[PDB]
Design a protein around this ligand. Structure first.
Ligand SMILES: *[C@@H]1O[C@H](CO)[C@@H](O[C@@H]2O[C@H](CO)[C@@H](O)[C@H](O)[C@H]2NC(C)=O)[C@H](O)[C@H]1NC(C)=O
Ligand SMILES: *[C@@H]1O[C@H](CO)[C@@H](O)[C@H](O)[C@H]1NC(C)=O
Ligand SMILES: *[C@@H]1O[C@H](CO)[C@@H](O)[C@H](O)[C@H]1NC(C)=O
Ligand SMILES: *[C@@H]1O[C@H](CO)[C@@H](O)[C@H](O)[C@H]1NC(C)=O
Ligand SMILES: *[C@@H]1O[C@H](CO)[C@@H](O)[C@H](O)[C@H]1NC(C)=O
Lengths: 267, 362, 316, 318
């Protein structure tokens, strides 16, 4: 089941060009209202981009005897835009969770699989015979028999290299491998809750004391000690989101310093 | 209610106009009367002879005292083993009626905990006193320092390391109010849904308590469908203590908060949910049943009537009959404003009174 | 043709496979009891108006009432004891938002107290409005373009500048049902003819088809197995025929009563429900962009009205 | 006593009901194969908790701080360059620029060189999107929910002695049970502190846990999972799933010398080996799943107040 926040560069030319041309037209018509008075152009541009700035700037108030109404409308306009933008970007990055799992054997997409849901088992596995006995596992048996693998490490490398897409395996081993390799994430449901013992001979008197020694390991905390050996020991980021943001900010800073060189050469 | 009494009254609704449409289609007259009891009629034992008999609508039909049961009857297997049934016109399932949607104060200042708010106020007070002491130990000045502290605290009305630490505290307070904004956002993310588990296979429903009061209609086909089911002895013994004659009895019982669950048809309780919003249905569509017309045996008015219903299926007859009353139905800015407006108005009145006091002194 | 050409011509006994039920098919053979709720439905693909008039309906009034009260307070404070007589409106409504509006250095103590109280009120109102927009995004409805069989779009595709498209399989019973409802709908569907079911599925996935008409539960199954829940029906069979499926036996077949009782046994015990659980995928449930269009356009219309008001105040 | 006294003294054949497994029962009779994974578990009070709003390390993670310092130094250096083109905002430009992060800085007299205004506009748009991302992280923090548990596991310090912590508590078991035998074979001090805190009935112990007559209890795992699957209110979810517990099974104790044993084992492995045991577990085990939530934000208030007092001491001594 495995970036740039879509601010201006992944999003198309609606919001940035719209706000830029809008504040341009607003600044031009308010400076033309300043012409019809009932570095003044630079002061009007500073006032317009300070209202669009909405974070604090050491500016005054120009001759706005009738421009103040359009200025306050544009100010409330800009703040309700940036408030709605903050709200829906946050709510966009909250509910951005699609369906990226199988939910167990009861999946009709796996009852009738295709070339995408690649699931298989180990070659000559007891789970294969366990599914071959049962009454409805015929299509999954025909799907798994095509790509049986020798070792489980082959299955791990195949599902790591996107050759597989699902694999039936014991749960705690997959939890240990998820602790080791964090890219391998299983599903949530659990099935075939079974017991695993030791492959033994027929009825032997030493076999009885072997089973009693296993029970002696059960009654004390030595099973928990074996869990301490293997089972218990497990193992808005703005580094892809706001990193290229700072790259374009630094490029804009270099270009703005170049424009300041142009302005000082002009004046 | 009554031992035996009969009055002529007015009947209308769905199946009445359906019979009018049939009389427009097929040439026949009517004799419209009501069922004697308030039961569908189950296969109950008669008082002797160890024999079970049907009654109710079947008891009125099989006696020759009825010709056609024009009613959306739950067509089961058992009643079709005896007499012939028509084609089911209605496809309708089962649902559970509960009493949900019980909510406001929104935790702004007075429903919000003012202990940490007074802690923030005393903290910025101690910070302002300490910065005035650093002004005294320099390497309306007190009033200017207090006004600057309480103005930068609220980010409005704002006119060397002391101001640096004060602006550290100001950004810290903006972190505080951003956490407050997130807390008020988390206040209105979700409600409390599913106070009763709607799962029919819930072991909490299989072993109920004294609070779980669920009932059914006395002697219905739903009771027969439960009687077939081989593991429904517990709910049968529960609902037999609360056998209800009419469905309006269950409507009045859950209306007075005496019931908690009721197995019933879907669209009826959907229309009752349109009536009252606290009467809430469920979404589990189980036992998708077919409702037709109660009919006799092999009859010349059987196949013609079935073909008439089939001819009625193609047009929008059931469509605009659903448009009559079935389709016909009958957080925001307003919740989080009222007590806020009243508290801010009272604070403004008290502040103006304190300004009268201060101008009377100054 | 087909199963009707096999059973009625007595080369087949009955149609145990699925079959639609209508007038003349019931005239030629006898169907069984309905065992599944399969009407008809329309499949379409994936994909607010304003935020001031419905939402800020009556809060707007009390905000203006308290704004006039606080403005009268500021006028009385300035007139008790340098330009805040009529210019308190711009200052006060800039401090409504706290847009860092450059107005004046506040020397009035009562003015600073009222500005502090109103700024705290503005912060908590901004928090409440962000929570309102969050709950508005949580309450996420998905409206459709067509919510009616008697649509004005279903009368002429010149109703809107892109004409949409929808068809069925040829020589089908659904075509006969449409021709028994509207011949003009068949005339518009004549230009929208296509052959295959999965061919229409490929046309819906690639975008070579707008809408599609088929049965209800089969399209529900197709939407359950839909890759990414890209295809959602219009409703759940509201403005449709609401028919069913049966087993068409011959007129006079003695097996009809036993098969009907067997189907009534198979439905009313959870066996049919077990088969529906086994054979219907339902992962795509209900109630599950970054650029709205109508809201800022309506604010643009109010902005054009503000241009008109600015012109009125400029000429006089 | 009980079923062991019935079977071993040949008044009963076998116990079909659920039976615990230990060494002495395997010595006196013979168990069957296990079929269900039922260990032990501990039920606690587990009152109302929060989602622990401790801090945030997602945007910066103690690596973007150098970028903040470098960008402040560049802003101050170009402010010095504009001052060279143009009287006290050499280092104070950094103060104004970080005051405009939280949009309430005192406006120092800005030069007409306009370069400072451009970089203030760029940093101000960056502060707008930074506060937007901060509120977005605060909104995304609401998605998960988890309240911490008072017991880490079987090696708890609270399991050692509740005098080590400031509230003392209590814990009981079933009387005369094999769980008590497992305690006395593993932890004698647990039996010592459990003997004075005994109880009578399992549902009675549940009522004692609800009404407040008991704090903790030790029982089997899946039976308490079933009790949570019938719990009124569902306020009790046990810690873990048998990971720090015994994790034993349930079997059928047959008499030593019964020919039924292999047939019963084949029947149990047939009942498991077809999904019918899964059907029985589905039928008999089925369950579901504030104004002062800032109990860890106030720890951040404590640390920031201590850092503010320390920096005030540093700026005051010199
Ligand atoms: C299995 O181990 C047990 C324990 O050592 C043995 O059983 C008992 O052993 C003790 C000590 O040798 C004797 O006093 C008892 O008489 C034994 N009882 C039984 C069950 O006979 C047992 O001998 C061992 N069996 C083997 C050889 O594996
Ligand atoms: C009987 O029905 C037929 C339907 O075509 C038609 O002749 C007329 O409606 C009816 N005639 C009588 C007997 O009124
Ligand atoms: C018949 O009547 C008697 C009157 O007491 C009643 O007890 C009995 O249950 C009735 N039998 C049935 C079930 O018809
Ligand atoms: C309807 O009624 C007529 C006259 O009773 C009968 O002959 C016919 O079979 C029925 N149905 C049809 C096919 O019209
Ligand atoms: C536990 O065992 C003792 C043995 O004397 C007995 O007296 C007591 O009643 C038992 N308690 C219970 C309730 O198990």
């Amino acid at each position: 089941k495995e970036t740039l926040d879509s601010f201006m560069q992944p999003f198309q030319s609606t919001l940035w060009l719209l706000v830029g041309l809008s504040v341009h037209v607003v600044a031009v018509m308010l400076y033309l209202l300043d012409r019809f008075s009932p570095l003044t152009l630079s002061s009007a541009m500073w006032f317009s981009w300070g209202v669009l700035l909405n974070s604090g700037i050491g500016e005054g108030a120009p001759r706005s005897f009738s421009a103040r109404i359009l200025g306050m409308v544009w100010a409330g306009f800009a703040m309700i835009i940036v408030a709605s933008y903050t709200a829906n970007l946050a709510a966009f990055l909250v509910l951005d969770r699609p369906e990226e799992r199988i939910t167990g054997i009861n999946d009709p997409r796996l009852r009738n699989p295709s070339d995408k849901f690649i699931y298989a088992t180990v070659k000559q596995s007891s789970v294969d015979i366990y599914f071959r006995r049962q009454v409805e596992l015929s299509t999954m048996y025909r799907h798994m028999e095509k790509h049986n693998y020798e070792s489980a490490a082959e299955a791990i490398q195949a599902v790591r290299d996107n050759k597989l897409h699902a694999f039936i395996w014991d749960s705690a081993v997959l939890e240990f491998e998820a602790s080791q390799k964090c890219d391998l994430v299983t599903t949530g449901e659990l099935f075939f809750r079974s017991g695993f013992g030791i492959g033994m001979r027929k009825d032997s008197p030493w076999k009885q004391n072997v089973s009693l020694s296993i029970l002696k390991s059960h009654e004390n905390g030595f099973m928990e000690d074996l869990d301490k050996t293997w089972v218990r020991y497990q193992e808005t980021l703005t580094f892809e989101n706001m990193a290229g943001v700072f790259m374009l900010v630094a490029g804009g800073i270099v270009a703005g310093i170049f424009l300041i060189f142009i302005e000082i050469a002009y004046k | 209610g009554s031992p035996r009494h009969t009055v002529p009254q007015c009947c209308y609704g769905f199946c009445i106009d359906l019979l009018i449409k049939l009389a427009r289609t097929m040439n026949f007259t009517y004799e419209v009367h009501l069922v004697a009891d308030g039961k569908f009629g189950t296969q109950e034992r008669v008082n002797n002879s160890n024999k079970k008999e049907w009654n109710g609508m079947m008891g009125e039909l099989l006696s020759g005292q009825a010709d056609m049961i024009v009613a959306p009857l739950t067509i089961n297997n058992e009643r079709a083993q005896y007499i012939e049934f028509s084609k089911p016109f209605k496809y309708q399932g089962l649902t559970i009626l509960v009493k949900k949607e019980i909510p406001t104060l929104d935790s702004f200042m007075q429903p919000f905990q003012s202990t940490l708010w007074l802690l923030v106020g005393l903290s910025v007070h101690v910070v302002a006193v300490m910065l005035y002491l650093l002004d005294r130990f320099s390497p309306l000045t007190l009033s200017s320092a207090m006004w600057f502290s309480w103005g930068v605290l609220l980010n409005s009305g704002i006119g060397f390391s002391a101001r640096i630490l004060g602006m550290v505290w100001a950004g810290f307070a903006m972190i505080i109010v951003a956490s407050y904004t997130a807390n008020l956002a988390a206040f209105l993310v979700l409600d409390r849904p599913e106070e009763r588990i709607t799962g029919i296979n819930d072991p909490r429903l299989r072993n109920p308590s004294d609070k779980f009061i669920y009932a059914t209609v006395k002697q219905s086909s739903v009771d027969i469908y439960f009687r077939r089911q081989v593991e429904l002895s517990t709910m049968y013994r529960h609902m037999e203590k609360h056998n209800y004659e009419s469905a309006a009895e269950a409507i009045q019982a859950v209306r007075d908060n005496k019931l908690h669950a009721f197995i019933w048809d879907s669209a009826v309780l959907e229309f009752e949910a349109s009536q009252k919003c606290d009467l809430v249905t469920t979404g589990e569509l189980f036992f998708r049943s077919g409702f037709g017309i109660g009919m006799r045996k092999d009859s010349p008015w059987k196949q013609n009537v079935s073909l008439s219903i089939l001819k009625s299926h193609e047009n929008g007859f059931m469509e605009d009959l659903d448009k009559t009353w079935v389709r016909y139905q009958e957080t925001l800015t307003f919740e989080n404003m009222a007590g806020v407006f009243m508290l801010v108005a009272g604070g403004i009145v008290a502040g103006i009174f304190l300004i009268f006091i201060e101008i009377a002194y100054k | 043709n087909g199963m009707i050409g096999e059973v009625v011509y007595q080369r087949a006994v009955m149609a145990v496979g699925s079959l639609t039920i209508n007038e003349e098919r019931s005239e030629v053979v006898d169907f069984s009891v309905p065992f599944v709720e399969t009407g008809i439905s329309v499949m379409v693909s994936r994909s607010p108006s304003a935020f001031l008039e419905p939402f800020s309906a009556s809060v707007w009034v009390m905000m203006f009432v308290m704004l006039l009260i606080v403005s009268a307070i500021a006028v009385f404070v300035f007139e008790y004891f340098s330009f805040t007589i009529g210019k308190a409106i711009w200052l006060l409504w800039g401090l409504v938002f706290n847009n860092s509006v450059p107005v004046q250095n506040p020397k009035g103590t009562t003015s600073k107290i009222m500005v502090s109280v109103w700024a705290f009120f503005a912060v908590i109102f901004l928090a409440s409005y962000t929570a309102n927009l969050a709950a508005f995004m949580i309450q996420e409805e998905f409206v459709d373009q067509v919510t009616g069989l008697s649509d004005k779009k279903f009368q002429r595709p010149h109703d809107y500048s892109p004409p949409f498209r929808f068809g069925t399989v040829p020589q089908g019973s659904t075509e006969r049902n449409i021709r028994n409802n509207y011949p003009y709908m068949h005339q518009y569907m004549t230009r929208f003819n296509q052959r295959g079911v999965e061919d229409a599925l490929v046309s819906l996935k690639t975008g070579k088809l707008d809408a599609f008409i088929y049965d209800a539960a089969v399209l529900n199954y197709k939407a359950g197995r839909d890759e990414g829940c890209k295809l959602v029906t219009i409703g759940s069979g509201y403005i449709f025929a609401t028919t069913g499926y049966g087993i068409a036996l011959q007129k006079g077949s003695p097996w009809k009563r036993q098969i009907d009782l067997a189907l009534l046994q198979f439905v009313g015990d959870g066996e049919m429900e077990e088969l529906e659980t086994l054979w219907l995928t339902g992962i795509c449930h209900n109630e599950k962009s970054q650029l709205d269009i109508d809201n800022m356009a309506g604010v643009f219309y109010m902005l054009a009205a503000a241009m008109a008001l600015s012109l009125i105040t400029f000429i006089w | 006593n009980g079923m062991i006294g019935e079977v071993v003294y040949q008044r009963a054949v076998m116990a079909v009901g659920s039976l615990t497994i230990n060494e002495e029962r395997s010595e006196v009779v013979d168990f069957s194969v296990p079929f269900v994974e039922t260990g032990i578990s501990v039920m606690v009070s587990r009152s109302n908790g929060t989602v622990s709003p401790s801090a945030f390390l997602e945007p910066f993670s103690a690596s973007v701080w150098v970028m903040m310092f470098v960008m402040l130094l560049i802003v101050s250096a170009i402010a010095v360059f504009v001052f060279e083109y143009f009287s006290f905002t050499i280092g104070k430009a950094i103060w104004l620029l970080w005051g405009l992060v939280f949009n309430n800085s005192v406006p120092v007299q800005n030069p007409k060189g306009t370069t400072s205004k451009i970089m203030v506009s760029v940093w101000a748009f960056f502060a707008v999107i930074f506060l937007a991302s901060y509120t977005a992280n605060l909104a995304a923090f609401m998605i998960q929910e988890e309240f911490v548990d008072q017991v880490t596991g079987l090696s708890d310090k609270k399991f050692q002695r509740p005098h080590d912590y400031s509230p003392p508590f209590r814990f009981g078991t079933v009387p005369n049970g094999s769980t008590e035998r497992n305690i006395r074979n593993n932890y004698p001090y647990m039996h010592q502190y459990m003997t004075r805190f005994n109880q009578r009935g399992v549902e009675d112990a549940l009522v004692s846990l609800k009404t407040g007559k008991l704090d903790a209890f030790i029982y089997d795992a899946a039976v308490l999972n079933y009790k949570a699957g019938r719990d009124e209110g569902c306020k009790l979810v046990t810690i873990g799933s048998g990971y720090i517990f015994a994790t034993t099974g349930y079997g059928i104790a047959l008499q030593k010398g019964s020919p039924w044993k292999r047939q019963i084992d084949l029947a149990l492995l047939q009942f498991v080996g077809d999904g019918e045991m899964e059907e029985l577990e589905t039928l008999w085990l089925t369950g579901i799943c504030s104004s002062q939530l800032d109990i860890d934000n106030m720890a951040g208030v404590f640390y920031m107040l201590a850092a503010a007092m320390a920096l005030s001491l540093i700026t005051f001594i010199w």
